[PDB]
Design a binder for this molecule. Structure first.
Ligand SMILES: [Zn+2]
Lengths: 1110, 147, 48, 49, 147, 49
DNA sequence: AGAAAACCCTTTATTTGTTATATAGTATTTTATCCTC
DNA sequence: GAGGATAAAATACTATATCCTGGTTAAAGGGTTTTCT
RNA sequence: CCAAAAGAAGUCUUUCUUUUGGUAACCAGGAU
């Protein structure tokens, strides 16, 4: 549509969108360039927040500096963070297992406050991992994604909880800071206002107020409008400020002698000295907004103040009093109401920059601790800024973050859509967020403030449902971490084109209409009554004069993955959730095909994911090949694009890239120049178009099972390539000298045929489980001084030749060609982990066809494993001899409420055959509002039905009534959309017509070949002698507690006794039963399991005298 | 009753163990914080893996190598002291550590309700003072010599 | 095919909520990698 | 849990609008979370019984 | 008195004495139940009980050496307190105070941890086991089969 | 004490069983499953065994 | 005989101190206050 | 006014279905030892 | 229970004898 070479996909959309879809990877990239402080972010903030532009690093270095000693006779300060160029390109870093990072330098200045001798230096602060142009990090070769975290913003939260004993309303307030100490004010069943500083027992608020320097006269002067505060003051029992300080000291400081100076200083230290208490800028902003204190002054300062505390107490007591609004002296009035903590005005987003800033902050705190401890144990005038700084904790924090965290994860690379979905994810679980096992049902709900900001459909189906969400298409995150959505403001009933981004609170104040409303070509609603959203998400019918805003489009409340489901509004939310979640499990196929009926989101999602090659500058193609494309730019310069051929992804799939241009074509900037894994000419192509029938067939498509044609196996329609990675390295060791070689002890030559002259197998050789990939031997150890042997070694010269082959064998259940071998070595001064001499990596590839038990799926949540694969002759075939490819059961459709698949089938038939609306005498009425150049289409036409503005039922019916014949003038599918099929197995025609069409089905990464496993006997564990677990070792299936209850219920005592003794851990029973079976004898009697004896020994180790009596 | 168990069980009895039972189960005393010699890869002596205490690491092979044959059985080498037998015995033989001071068991001190504080009638708060060297306790007094 | 004749095999689906989550069948060889289950035992196993 | 008094007025054959779809998701997700969280309580109860 | 009498009657009825609450020797579990195995490259994988036993042995040896050498009462009591804390960590790590942490600031697995929870000996290994002669796969529909 | 220790609160059951010096007669299904003996139900009782 | 680069041991210390997303259930110690003598 | 007995609150411990696979496994500092010049 | 080497017999490739060699916990992600 707005891409220079996109395919012509004609849309059914009736509406027009004013706003283009933003960059879909803007969250990550605009959050990181704020952290490092790029000029791009500087300009972006200038045209917005020019009042105070500062990056994350500069903020950390400003809050840290200066670092002073108690005497104040010397200080250390930091400034001007600076980055060098990256150490190596992205491709080299990924190939050689190097972290993609850049050096960081700061200017530390040391001042002696009694000699004025200033000493500045440039201090190296470590290597800082840098984000690539696709929103990912490259840590130790692998590609990672940092996920954005949904947390609760810091501020003041008022809530009311009923009381069981008295049936009274009990209000409360919590002042949650960033990295500080809490303090709650509450009204208990008795009419008194308490306080819980830090986390202690309730104390009257009067104690705190007096400790802050308030006389009993001032309190009753300002807080004289409530009976509760007077009641609390009267029964205070505390007179004098010092007494209040002492009481607070008693409560807070356990078992210490109270005094005046310590109590005076500790209270101000806890909440007012900003080294132990911070609110951030978001917290200060939220407190000022809730209480309305400083509307004008800019936010500089992050500590509490007496004004804030007194205002909070007054707000709480007036809320309990039942007031409506409150004005604070020196500040505008505000409404008095309780808070909802699940409101997207109270939940903010910690993006990829905020998290790294927090980690740098703790690292710098540790470093400054070391610095100020080291400033007192070194003699002055020998100190230089380089001898105080210890950079190791800082670099340690970064490593800990990027290696160990629940937000730093391996990038999801099942297919291109998976990674884009991974980068736009908002997870509520992490360090500092709630927990999967401790999350209720009120936080998993879809609050009405999510509209336009978090997609209500796309979320995990398991125990993570509701705790992980995804960002909508048009949403952006503002400077404080709050999500915004564009709205089209309507002035005096005229729908303008001024787009304004509103966060959930502003959207709360106003009244918002709907996108699919009847605009009359002049920005005027046809009727006065339109559905709107009122304050608490209420939906009503307001006359079209109060409306303030309208949505920029439908498809504003959905995310990227959910915007690719055609006919989404005909499917219930339960099945649409599955349809969106199963699109990121599809596996790339050997050849890709774009859907006949899409939604128009595929091109944008494909170009923004980044798996395609896009012309950086316009020019003319000079050379094309399977390996590269050379573009000749309009001005002299040339550029060569290299391709990724058969490269493994994080999940073991193929990552091909092939060109889609010829040697003479001219390309334009931003034009797709080479396809990717799951792209067909620049558009996402996750599956294939299959001819489908919707009948029950002989019980093989029974209960969600599926029937496939054998053509899909012969013609490699659903074939995929899977690649495996195997690693081994040679390490020094204390004994020394690990070696990769062909000379392996106790190995014959027949099992050393595929290996090349120096170990590793040859490229192209097919392997089976157990074959050796890299030959390797290590010292046998047991360095022993046996007289004759040792005296022969020492002077006579007998060699050690102690070897123990730790070779690399291909594990159980694996095979395929050897496509690549990557060998590192210390001889070539390659950067390897310390103590490693050599490192070799072998890639093994398989090509898998579709087979029974493999999982398939559509875009509407119609999953199911393949039940049978019929020969092409015994399948229902059309009157012209065309067999169907897939057969789906009827009983699954009407009960699940996903009728969108039937409409997709009808429109797919119409698109495949091509149509022509006969406007011989006037266009038909059903085709009146149908866009032009949709009145006719050629066979195999690609169309698009946007998610909430697509093809109506009347238009589908009309298109079905007029559809082109195939070769002879025969129309196979009638106006109802059904065809007369023949039974290819018996020969007779089926008595009634059946629904046929084209559906777009996907192959999911749940194949049987990874799921099948069996075991007679094999490896056993060590501590307990039970069999191992897992397919790669061998392992047995687990016979758990529930399966034991089932067998006890049946009454089968002998089966249960043998299963637990002579099949698991009866060490002599195992061998005896094997011998009895092979020799044809009777199975012997079981003994005692070994785990019971292990249990007895552990109990005895706990100093318990366990003994078995007779 | 049974010792190595032949499944003639009639009962399973649990109870507190005294020091005399602990040093009766034992086959030796561990008195060095060593596990294994990294170079020869053989267990050290008087360590956590000593072959004299816990038994041979290899079937019918002593530590010093004087005995290596099955014919030798049930005899303790006079040099290394390792008893020549099957290596499976390392799953069965226990040692013990002879503490230089008495130490309480945390199961009968901490677990709520405190069972030492019920046996002796002491609140847990001040029992923790006694057993962690944070206060003295009067264990005995003469009440007539006093008078 | 001679060995497996009239030798029962126990099939089990997790979670085994009740007794009929384990039942014994008579195996027969099939082409493929998937276990074929009778349609009239899915209510007992609760197996779609 | 209280009824929205609007109500949704379209069938899934006609296709719901954006607001109707939103207010329907409100209860759809509640239903899904209910199952997700009862699957474990059933097993704990059976284990105790 | 009703609560107290439970334990007092328990210690009264039986011939067992209450002195088993205070320990003078500690048993050591057989090596095969706390194994260290050779990972390729001269790297070993300890069982995480060896660290806890080593701490006990080190503290006991230091206290034993500080008594014969002669020292004030302050230092000897400090060593005894630390020895007391080591055995507590060996038997139940983290029930009193800060858990003893190994590499990566992860608490060690004490003896009590081998018995508790879904991953304890009982539920994990005694009541449910992995077995031989087993297999698994994906089920499909068998409309041609008999019942 | 074996069945109760394997059910819940292993540490508390074990400590109070040790203090009471309890003896287990091994008469239940779970206790016979743990030690590897034929359960006293169905086909494992003396009438049929 | 002295200097530099690689081993062996320890320990995550625990202050008159660097740590705030669960609820639901029961059980046991404080403790605070009220009632009585 | 003092002591005891009963509500209250405050901490302490315990539990939350089954199955599968994939990536990592210590750092940092002090004292010492050995080899090289 | 397997691999390698040597000796003997026959078959043209099996048997007999001797020697050597022979795992877990965390965190994370999915499925029903
Ligand atoms: Zn010997």
């Amino acid at each position: 549509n707005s891409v220079p070479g996109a395919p012509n996909r004609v849309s059914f959309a009736k509406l027009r969108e004013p706003l283009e879809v933003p960059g879909l990877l803007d969250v990550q990239t605009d959050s990181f360039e704020w952290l490092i402080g790029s000029p791009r972010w500087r300009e972006s903030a200038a045209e917005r927040g020019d009042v105070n532009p500062v990056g994350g690093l500069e903020e950390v270095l400003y809050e840290l500096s200066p670092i002073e000693d108690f005497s104040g006779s010397m200080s250390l300060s930091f400034s001007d963070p600076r980055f060098d160029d990256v150490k190596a390109p992205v491709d080299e870093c990924k190939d050689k297992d190097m972290t993609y990072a850049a050096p960081l330098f700061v200017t530390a200045e040391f001042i002696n406050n009694n000699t004025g001798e200033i000493k500045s230096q440039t201090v190296f602060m470590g290597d800082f991992p840098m984000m690539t142009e696709k929103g990912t990090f490259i840590i130790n070769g692998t590609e990672r994604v940092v996920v954005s975290q949904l947390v609760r913003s810091p501020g003041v939260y008022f809530d009311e909880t009923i009381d069981k004993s008295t049936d009274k309303t009990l209000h409360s307030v919590k002042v949650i800071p960033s990295r500080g100490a809490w303090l709650e004010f509450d009204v208990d069943k008795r009419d008194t206002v308490g306080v819980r500083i830090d986390r202690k027992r309730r104390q009257p608020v009067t104690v705190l107020l007096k400790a802050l320097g308030w006389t009993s006269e001032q309190i009753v002067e300002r807080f004289g409008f409530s009976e509760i505060m007077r009641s609390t003051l009267e029964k205070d029992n505390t007179v004098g400020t010092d007494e209040a300080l002492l009481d607070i000291y008693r409560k807070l400081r356990p078992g210490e002698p109270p005094t005046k100076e310590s109590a005076q200083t500790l209270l101000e230290n806890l909440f007012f000295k900003e080294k132990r208490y911070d609110l951030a800028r978001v917290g200060r902003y939220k407190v000022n907004k809730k209480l309305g204190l400083h509307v004008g002054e800019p936010i500089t300062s992050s500590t509490l103040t007496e004004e804030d505390v007194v205002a909070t107490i007054e707000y709480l007591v007036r809320l309990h009093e039942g007031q409506t609004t409150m004005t604070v002296p020196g500040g505008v009035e505000v409404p008095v109401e309780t808070d909802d903590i699940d409101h997207f005005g109270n939940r903010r987003l910690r993006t990829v920059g905020e998290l790294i800033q927090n980690q740098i902050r703790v690292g710098m705190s540790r470093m400054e601790r070391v610095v100020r401890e080291r400033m007192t144990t070194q003699d002055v005038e020998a100190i230089t800024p380089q001898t105080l700084i210890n950079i190791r904790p800082v670099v340690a924090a970064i490593k800990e973050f990027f290696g160990t965290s629940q937000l730093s994860q391996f990038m999801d690379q099942n297919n291109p859509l998976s990674g884009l979905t991974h980068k736009r994810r908002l997870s509520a679980l992490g360090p500092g967020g709630l927990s999967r096992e401790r999350a209720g049902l009120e936080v998993r709900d879809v609050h009405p403030s999510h509209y336009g900001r978090m997609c209500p459909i796309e979320t995990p189906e398991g125990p993570n449902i509701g705790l992980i969400g995804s960002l909508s298409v048009y949403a952006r995150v503002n400077p404080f971490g709050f999500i915004e959505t564009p709205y089209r403001k309507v002035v005096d009933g005229v729908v303008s084109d001024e787009i304004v981004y509103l966060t959930a609170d502003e959207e709360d104040r106003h009244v918002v209409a709907q996108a699919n409303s009847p605009i009359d070509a002049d920005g005027r609603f046809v009727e006065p009554r339109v559905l709107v959203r009122r304050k608490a998400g209420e939906v009503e019918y307001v006359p079209s004069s109060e409306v303030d805003y309208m949505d920029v489009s439908p498809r504003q409340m959905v995310s990227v993955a959910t915007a690719m489901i055609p006919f989404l509004e005909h499917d219930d939310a339960n099945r649409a959730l599955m349809g969106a979640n199963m699109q990121r499990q599809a596996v790339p196929l050997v050849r890709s095909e774009a859907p006949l009926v899409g939604t128009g989101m595929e091109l944008r999602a494909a170009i923004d994911a980044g798996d395609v090659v896009v012309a950086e500058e316009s020019g003319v193609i000079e050379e094309v090949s399977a390996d590269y494309i050379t573009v000749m730019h309009d001005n002299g310069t040339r550029r060569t694009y290299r391709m990724r051929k058969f490269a493994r992804s994080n999940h073991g799939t193929c990552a091909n890239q092939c060109p889609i241009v010829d040697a003479g074509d001219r390309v334009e900037a931003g034009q797709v120049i080479a396809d990717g894994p799951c792209t067909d000419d620049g558009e996402m192509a996750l599956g294939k178009n299959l001819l489908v029938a919707i009948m029950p067939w002989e019980g093989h498509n029974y209960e969600d099972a599926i029937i496939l044609s054998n053509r899909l196996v012969e013609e490699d329609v659903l074939t995929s390539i899977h690649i495996e990675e195997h690693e081994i390295d040679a390490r020094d060791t204390k004994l020394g000298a690990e070696e990769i070689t062909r000379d392996i002890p106790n190995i014959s030559d027949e099992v050393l045929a595929d290996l090349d002259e120096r170990g590793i197998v040859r490229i192209g050789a097919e392997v089976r489980d157990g074959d050796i990939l890299v030959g390797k031997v290590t010292p046998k150890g047991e360095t022993e001084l046996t007289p004759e042997e040792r005296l022969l070694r020492a002077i006579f010269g007998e060699k050690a030749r102690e070897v123990r082959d730790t070779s690399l064998k291909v594990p159980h259940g694996e095979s395929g060609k050897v496509i690549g071998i990557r060998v590192f070595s210390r001889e070539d001064e390659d950067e390897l982990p310390a103590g490693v001499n050599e490192l070799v990596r072998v890639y093994v590839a398989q090509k898998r066809k579709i087979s029974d038990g493999d999982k398939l799926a559509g875009r509407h949540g119609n999953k199911g494993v393949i039940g049978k694969i019929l020969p092409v002759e015994d399948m229902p075939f059309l009157a012209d001899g065309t067999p169907v490819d897939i057969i789906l059961n009827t009983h699954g459709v009407p009960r699940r409420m996903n009728i969108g698949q039937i409409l997709e089938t009808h429109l797919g038939w119409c698109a495949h055959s091509g149509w022509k609306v006969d406007a011989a005498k006037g266009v038909p009425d059903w085709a009146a509002r149908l866009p032009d150049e949709l009145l006719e289409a050629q066979p195999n036409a690609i169309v698009s039905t946007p998610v909430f503005d697509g093809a109506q039922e009347a238009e589908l019916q009309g298109l079905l009534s007029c559809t082109l014949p195939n070769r002879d003038g025969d129309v196979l599918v009638d106006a109802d959309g059904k065809a007369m099929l023949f039974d290819g197995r018996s020969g007779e025609p089926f008595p009634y017509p059946v629904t046929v069409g084209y559906m777009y089905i996907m192959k999911l990464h749940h194949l049987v070949d990874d799921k099948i496993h069996a075991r007679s006997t094999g490896p056993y564990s060590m501590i307990t002698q039970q069999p191992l677990g897992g397919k790669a070792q061998f392992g047995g299936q687990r016979f758990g507690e529930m399966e034991c209850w089932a067998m006890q219920a049946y009454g089968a005592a002998y089966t249960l006794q043998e299963l637990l003794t002579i099949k698991s851990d009866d060490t002599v029973g195992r061998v005896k039963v094997y011998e009895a079976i092979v020799k044809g004898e009777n199975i012997p009697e079981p003994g005692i399991p070994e785990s019971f004896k292990v249990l007895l020994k552990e109990l005895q180790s706990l100093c318990l005298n366990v003994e078995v009596l007779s | 009753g049974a010792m190595l168990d032949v499944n003639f069980f009639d009962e399973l009895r649990i109870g507190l163990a005294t020091a005399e039972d602990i040093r009766q189960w034992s086959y030796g005393e561990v008195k060095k914080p060593e596990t294994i010699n990294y170079r020869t890869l053989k267990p050290e002596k008087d360590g956590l893996f000593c072959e004299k205490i816990f038994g041979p690491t290899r079937d019918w092979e002593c530590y010093c190598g004087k005995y290596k044959r099955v014919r030798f059985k049930g005899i303790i080498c006079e040099r290394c002291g390792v008893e020549v037998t099957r290596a499976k015995v390392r799953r069965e033989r226990m040692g013990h550590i002879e503490l230089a001071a008495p130490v309480t068991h945390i199961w009968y001190f901490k677990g709520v309700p405190s069972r030492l504080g019920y046996l002796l009638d002491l609140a847990p708060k001040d029992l923790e003072k006694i057993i962690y060297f944070a206060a003295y306790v009067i264990t005995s007094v003469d009440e007539e010599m006093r008078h | 095919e001679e060995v497996i004749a009239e030798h029962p095999v126990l099939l089990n689906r997790a979670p085994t909520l009740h007794r009929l989550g384990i039942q014994a069948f008579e195996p027969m060889l099939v082409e493929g990698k998937a276990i074929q289950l009778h349609p009239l035992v899915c209510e007992a196993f609760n197996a779609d | 849990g209280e009824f929205i008094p609007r109500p949704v007025k379209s069938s899934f054959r006609e296709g719901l609008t954006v607001l109707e779809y939103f207010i329907n998701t409100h209860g759809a997700r509640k239903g899904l979370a209910d199952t997700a969280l009862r699957t474990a309580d059933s097993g704990y109860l059976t284990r105790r019984l | 008195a009703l609560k107290r009498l439970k334990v007092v009657a328990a210690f009264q009825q039986s011939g067992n004495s209450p002195m088993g609450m205070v320990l003078d020797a500690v048993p050591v579990i057989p090596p095969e139940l706390r194994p260290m195995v050779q990972l390729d490259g001269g790297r070993f994988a300890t069982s995480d009980l060896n660290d806890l036993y080593r701490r006990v042995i080190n503290r006991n040896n230091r206290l034993k050496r500080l008594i014969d050498l002669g020292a004030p009462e302050i230092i000897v009591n400090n060593e005894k307190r630390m020895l007391q804390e080591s055995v507590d960590a060996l038997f139940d790590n983290g029930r009193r105070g800060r858990p003893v942490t190994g590499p990566g600031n992860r608490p060690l697995k004490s003896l009590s941890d081998l018995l508790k929870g879904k991953q304890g000996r009982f539920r994990q290994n005694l009541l449910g086991k992995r077995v031989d002669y087993s297999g698994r796969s994906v089920i499909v529909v068998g409309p041609q089969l008999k019942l | 004490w074996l069945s109760a220790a394997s059910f819940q609160e292993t540490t508390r059951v074990l400590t109070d069983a040790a203090i009471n010096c309890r003896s287990d007669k091994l008469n239940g299904l779970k206790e016979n499953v743990i030690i590897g003996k034929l359960i006293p139900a169905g086909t494992g009782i003396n009438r049929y065994r």
